[PDB]
Design a protein around this ligand. Structure first.
Ligand code: CA
Lengths: 225, 222, 233, 215, 223
């Protein structure tokens, strides 16, 4: 029969397989659309902030440039951690310590943001990996039930069992149609999350470089009046 | 008709089905016990991390964590650092203290990570060998099918059907055992990674407090 | 019953034995093949030229016994020269640090900068290889979809028209298999080209890291020799 | 019958023999190594200085791992006598202990490769056997001319036996391989723990000594 | 297997000849790189044993003098001496140490990379040989199904040849794929071990240099 009349004419287990695979497709495309608009906005904002800080030339100038980036700015956050470390460290003779403590801080928040970016990629990787074998389960179960049928009666003449076989194969087709776009989407999102991490670490590095240079130049100006 | 499929079938395939069945049960037991364990451990650690965010020195962190409980992971990290300070008493070299402390604490995070994945070994091997076992069953079934053609001498469809049915059942059960073990192993591996990361953040907070405090004490003496 | 009235057809008459879905799988796979080969031909000449240029720069700078001599060597390398960019970054760090007492800081900052740049370049080399790895990964399974859908249609044919024989849905079965065959032919060159690019990119990264390391070593040694000559005249 | 099918089957059973040899011998090795290290680490728990750790380990047996790590640290101190730079000693000692620990891990892993591959490829040489046999059968039905698969069916069943055996060979290879891999993991952690204790003792004693010498 | 491959299809003839060339390449790579790794690891193991006796960099240089021109150890020692000569006149021994370790660990990496050469081809052959064999079989059964119609009968004898050629493609695909991947893994493991040993020799060189710098500095400070 049709693909439709072929679905509900199948075994309850095979029905389950087909419906589950279709829902998997829905989750794939939902994740795709939302995360796509998200990454485009964040990448634009970060690129803008980064090129504005490119001119910074000191850490206080960078703070002045970043003042209006918004409270949700990742650059503003990294700059604020460096400022927080300096202020907590007021009175210390050891600039190496400040530098150490600041690098540890920035590198850790960058890492954390990357871990936010990937939330949901676990579902994509899992769907693309497991969908073909789930479809495969469906068709194996369907054809298994078919052959359990042919030796009961017990028949010959393949044309009689053909519909159950076709209905079973539809399960594998749906399994593949679910997996392939999941795999593709997973690949692009991995590439973009990597690129985003790289950009964010670029800003964090700008911050550390400014802080390091500032500490050294100030210590030198203080040692020789 | 699964109970009817169960022994309608060959002794070898009875073995395949029962063994794989057990594989599934151990898989899901592991899933439920360790999964609830991870929910609880994560919830407790996240709470302790919030309370300790309010600490502006190490002594205050120790005061905040005092009543965290006997098995608290944050309390263990703080105490490891306190132990290094106590053992290093009288030393002029704060770089040495900092170094020794990080080494100890990071070495601790790793170990906690190692014991979270303790059950994962079983999952990894089950998902590893379940298709093999399954495949054996199905290879057995098709083999029997040819014995039918040989003993019956009639090559119609009704003769080959039992072996094909058996074989397919073995493949189906092989998939049911293999797939969840594999994805559960991956989910647990991810959860362990995030937990190691959170715990590493608490250790980081401890190290930063100790480093800043040492520097400030040394400057107040100069 | 005896003899026949029928026959089969050629490649164009096989195409007539697939449904609309399988026709799409085949044509889409073949276009996929075209993008793999365009990627290959475009990136190949690019990589070759940059690799020759960099190889020359690296051999010439390997002779530099000092950071000043290295600057003289690279003087006219061109505006787009990667080596010249690394040297200019080291010079920039020295210049931004003018007035500082701490040479460790300069060394630290310079290494942090240069290593960063090398990594970025690697990323700018990897552009498009994701298309290759993805094409080589999923093309055999796109082909498999074609095959599964085809045999499904064949079993529908067996079911509506009774009895059996074959001869009817047999061409459709052959066409379905053909879809997997085309899938494999799409996957293989993608996988091989991809491996070649992974190797060549690895070597290019090593060459850049060699230039970068030579720059850092010259800067480190020169800072220390200057510091020692300033302490003890 | 045929020829190569039976050689696939025998080569698989040979592979099984190798699997079992590795299993028994490695079982002994890992269990004795783990027991020795566990005790050594418990006894070293008490030492309040590097010297106290050497003295405790001094009768561990000549092949003890803990005693070797301690002797590396002691050797580095002895070689560096006369030196005013304790950061150097520390550095050198860590480098040594890191290398030595790594090398020991290398040795403990040896032979696990054979398990990994036997478990990986054993079902495919099995498959090769059946494919070869059934290929022979189907050149057989091409010869003469037959129908009624019943003539060639027993040969085809014999051919499948080769895959069956391939899977049987692979299964224990794979399990033993996993068990031994978790073992190598635990052991590397234990060895790193003793190494770490050595480094901490030496570092702390170097610092308390340098301070007391200044004042 | 003689008349057989003579009567086959041109495409399947291509998959077969390609697969067997893959096989010959794997075994050529295997024999040459096998003896090469054997000789190099013998040489290095002897050198590491002999250098374990050095109590300083000069003593190591005397031990290594006749190691030969192709010796990796001599290369490492000469590199470390070169760093000492270029830094002559510098008061900063931290710098010297830093520069030296950086150089040696990169030389080690480079040797590893140079041995990783050609293992790529094994990795690629082991990667695509199942795809080619599998293509062969897919083509074979495709052609057998084309065979049944026309003549438009089922039976067996015209269905059997396509089955025979497909199975042949699988078999030769296995014979090409399996040894290529196994050899690739064995060589990757050997390369890892050699790189670790070489790093061990390098570390010996670094430690001797470090200790000598510190002892010279101490003998100058407290004469
Ligand atoms: Ca220092």
């Amino acid at each position: 029969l049709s693909v439709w009349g072929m679905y509900q004419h199948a075994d309850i287990v095979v029905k389950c397989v087909m419906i589950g695979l279709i829902l998997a497709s829905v989750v794939t495309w939902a994740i795709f659309f939302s995360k796509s608009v998200e990454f485009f906005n964040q990448k634009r904002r970060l690129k803008r902030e980064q090129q504005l800080l490119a001119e910074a030339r000191s850490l206080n100038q960078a703070n002045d440039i970043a003042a209006d980036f918004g409270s949700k700015s990742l650059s503003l956050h990294l700059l604020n951690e460096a400022q927080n470390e300096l202020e907590l460290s007021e009175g210390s003779d050891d600039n190496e310590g400040i530098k150490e403590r600041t690098s540890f801080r920035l590198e850790r928040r960058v890492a954390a943001v990357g871990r936010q970016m990937g939330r949901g990629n676990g579902y994509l990787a899992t769907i693309g990996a497991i969908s073909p074998f789930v479809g495969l389960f469906g068709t194996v179960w369907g054809i298994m039930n078919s052959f359990i049928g042919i030796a009961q009666t017990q028949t010959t003449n393949l044309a009689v069992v053909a519909p159950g076989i076709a209905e079973a194969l539809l399960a594998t087709a749906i399994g593949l149609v679910a997996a392939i776009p999941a795999v593709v989407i997973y690949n692009v999102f991995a590439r973009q999350i990597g690129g985003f991490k790289a950009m964010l670490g670029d800003v964090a590095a700008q911050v550390l470089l400014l802080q390091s240079r500032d500490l050294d130049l100030e210590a030198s100006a203080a040692a020789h009046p």
